[PDB]
Amino acid sequence: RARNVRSHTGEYAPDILVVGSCFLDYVGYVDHMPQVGETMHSVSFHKGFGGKGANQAVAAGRLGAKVAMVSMVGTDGDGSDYIKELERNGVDTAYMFRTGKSSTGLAMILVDTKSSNNEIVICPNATNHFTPELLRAQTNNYERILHTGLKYLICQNEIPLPTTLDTIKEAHSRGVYTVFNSAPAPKPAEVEQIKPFLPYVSLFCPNEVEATLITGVKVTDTESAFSAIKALQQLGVRDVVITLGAAGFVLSENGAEPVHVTGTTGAGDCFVGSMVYFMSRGRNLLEACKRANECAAISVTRKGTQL
């Protein structure tokens, strides 16, 4: 077993649960994009650990969080490699599920540094079979992962939507503080499914496009972001944070006067996971988001020295 094991007494039960995606990033650096029928060689290769769920868990884990990842990977060696990497970055893996019927999720990424263009083919693989029915079957209808000590759930939109939404609803019903980063951007039929679950979301943390798709408010600046915050509170979200990329973020804590704070692969994931870590340490939303925003800049720098 690569995975952690829970105790009978629950003495290592997490403060933060992340229910989401784990994808390996297979990055081939090429002198040009392949044309149809072409066999070529890479000039360099790099294997990375991604998926927004793993990214957000690892962000928290690297700051010391008592975080656990709930996801699905393969029984393949790639799955084993992810499980170990999560442990080495402070993420408990006891509730990582493994399937022999699918490969671990991955993205195949081609990069032309010359032209600095990309091509990306996302292969969620095992992820696609991470359904609410399977989750419930493996967790005694969520009882195994939503223990009484649990303070935070983080979800994204990179696993089957019903799994994300049903988990949010169940955690919220137990008094868990639920955090939903709706990334990647929801499609029209996903927006429709999401809206009735928004009353079970303690904290909705979209970027501008995501806020635009959910609320129908065109978010391009602080003013429109503040309007989106209102639209989201009306849909029943308690706390809102809308990230504005490099231009900072806006937030409202439980309907108080919104606040604007002034200002890259996976920087957003670093922000979200860091934010929850700080909240788990007792910071309020604003304090957590300022600290998260700084962690996110430090992450970009640290990342830049490695690649």
Add this chain to the structure above:
Amino acid sequence: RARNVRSHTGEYAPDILVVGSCFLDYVGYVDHMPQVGETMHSVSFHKGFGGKGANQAVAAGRLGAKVAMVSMVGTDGDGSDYIKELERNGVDTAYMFRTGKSSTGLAMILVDTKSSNNEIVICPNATNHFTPELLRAQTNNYERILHTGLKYLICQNEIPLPTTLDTIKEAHSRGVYTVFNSAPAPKPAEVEQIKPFLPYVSLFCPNEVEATLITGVKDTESAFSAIKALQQLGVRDVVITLGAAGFVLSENGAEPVHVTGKHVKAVDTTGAGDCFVGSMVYFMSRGRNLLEACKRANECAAISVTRKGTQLSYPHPSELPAGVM
């Protein structure tokens, strides 16, 4: 340790040594080929075991060969998965080398569902470090992998060329029968390096393109003259594969023979050449002469083209019609 362990008595020393590539095949099926700047999802994904070296070893292993793979993979999960897969296909992995400084070699392969065309980016990764100097350092200057009873070496052209050429020379000098399948096709600088080593090649088994690049000779009758060119360059036995026109061969300079392709309905020919080479050597290790071995290899390759899956399409004995084994 996933890898096999040798005994001090040489109890399990192989009859056939394959010194070549192991690549994981990451196969993404897509609605269309990604355009520049496109992010898409696959329709489905398939993980396969490839590399011409492993393919050829596995072809032989599946027929029951006492075959061992010499290659380089990662300490990663892909590495461990290949090492187990090889054992499950009857290939000894005692001389599989592992590096923690590189990932396992892989091919990223996109397959268009409609047009059935491919785009392929090869990432040799650990394979790039599979050098003569490293091979020597890990085998006591080849002593550990070239024991007396070793009968056959198989090489391709999917590792560093010096590793291939130096191994062929050392094996040949110990009286091992050396098989060299120059695939993928050698590049111009590779052709110049290879030609001086052809006297150390017992059996050269190129396709048409590859024979052309090596010989200077550009169908059956030109293939026959390419054979003569290769014998002159020092190659003892020659087999040139012709895709659909079967193949031509000459044993030790005897009158060439042409053998017709088995006319089957080819659904997926991926790895079929590798099937032919590995199967050929297997049959020679069981005592068949070159023509007999290639006829049986031909039957095996024919069976492989009737289904998808590359190594998975390679037959096991129980699956074969009578008169192949």
